[PDB]
Amino acid sequence: PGPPGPPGPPGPGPRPPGPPGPPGPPG
Amino acid sequence: PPGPPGPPGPPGPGPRPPGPPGPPGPP
Amino acid sequence: PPGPPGPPGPPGPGPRPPGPPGPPGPP
Structure with missing residues (x-):
């Protein structure tokens, strides 16, 4: 033999979503 | 031979961007 | 033979989604 x-x-792996964005500004 | x-x-998970900033607050 | x-x-890391919008801002 x-x-x-x-x-x-x-063998590319699977793609986590990022964290929530920061608080918005003052109104 | x-x-x-x-x-x-x-297969190889990719890395986790932060979300957009939130809405403006109260006036 | x-x-x-x-x-x-x-093995093959996968691609990096953005997070959701942040909370409403403060006064």
């Missing part, structure tokens, strides 16, 4: 073949192709 | 390439690797 | 299949490829 020959040697093992090459490594498989490389 | 050498074997065939392996299968594709595993 | 041909050798064994290669190992699985290496």
Whole structure:
């Protein structure tokens, strides 16, 4: 039997939403 | 001969921007 | 005969959404 073949192709992962924005300014 | 390439690797989660600033407050 | 299949490829981080709007501002 020959040697093992090459490594498989490389596997990008899934995309969390950012935090809530800061409080708004004064009215 | 050498074997065939392996299968594709595993999937790689991406990093978490802050939301928009909130509405203006009371007058 | 041909050798064994290669190992699985290496793992693939995914893409970075913005957060929701912040709270209403103060007076």
